[PDB]
């Protein structure tokens, strides 16, 4: 068992219908990885909400992101989203249909760095 050689997965996975393992996904990650280099805020939080309507697991239409950059320093509430939306225009125009984007500043975050994407239902 020496490394170097070129192996291969070679393993039938098989899984159709409902798939959504591991936290986040390739879409969400991007939404972040993007804004990450498309804004490079001080605090970029993102997670899967999928809670409200009557949709089965896997639905990645509703999302919540928390961006913390100075870009939105005394800016409009629309512009903020626009900025992101602009970077991830395909997101809002494809998979994501409506995601609550949190546009804050590195000055305000400090005040209330506590987000609110979910209720206090922890244990």
Curated annotation (Swiss-Prot):
Highest taxon in the source lineage: Eukaryota
Primary location class: mitochondrion
PTM Phosphoserine: at which residues? 76
One cellular component (GO) term of this entry: iron-sulfur cluster assembly complex
- Keywords, alphabetical: Mitochondrion, Phosphoprotein
Chain residue ranges for the region called Disordered: 110-123
List localization entries: Mitochondrion
UniProt keyword Phosphoprotein present? yes
* Record function comment: Acts as a mitochondrial iron-sulfur (Fe-S) cluster assembly factor that facilitates (Fe-S) cluster insertion into a subset of mitochondrial proteins. Probably acts together with the monothiol glutaredoxin GLRX5. May protect cells against oxidative stress.
Give the family from UniProt: Belongs to the BolA/IbaG family.
Query: Which proteins does it associate with, and in what oligomeric form?
Result: Interacts with GLRX5.
Q: What is this protein called?
A: BolA-like protein 1
Q: What is the lineage of its organism?
A: Eukaryota, Metazoa, Chordata, Craniata, Vertebrata
* Gene behind this protein: Bola1
What fragment of the whole protein does this chain represent?
13 to 128 of 137
């Amino acid at each position: 068992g020496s490394s170097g050689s070129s192996g291969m997965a070679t393993r039938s996975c098989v899984s159709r219908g409902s798939a959504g393992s591991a936290a986040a996904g390739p879409v969400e990650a991007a939404i972040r990885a993007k804004l990450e280099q498309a804004l490079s805020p001080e605090v970029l939080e993102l997670r899967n909400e999928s809670g409200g309507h009557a949709v089965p697991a896997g639905s990645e239409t509703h999302f919540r992101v928390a961006v913390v950059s100075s870009r939105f320093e005394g800016m409009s509430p629309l512009q903020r989203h626009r900025l992101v939306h602009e970077a991830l225009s395909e997101e809002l125009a494809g998979p994501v249909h409506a995601l609550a984007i949190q546009a804050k500043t590195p000055a305000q975050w400090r005040e209330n760095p506590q987000l609110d994407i979910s209720p206090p239902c922890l244990g």
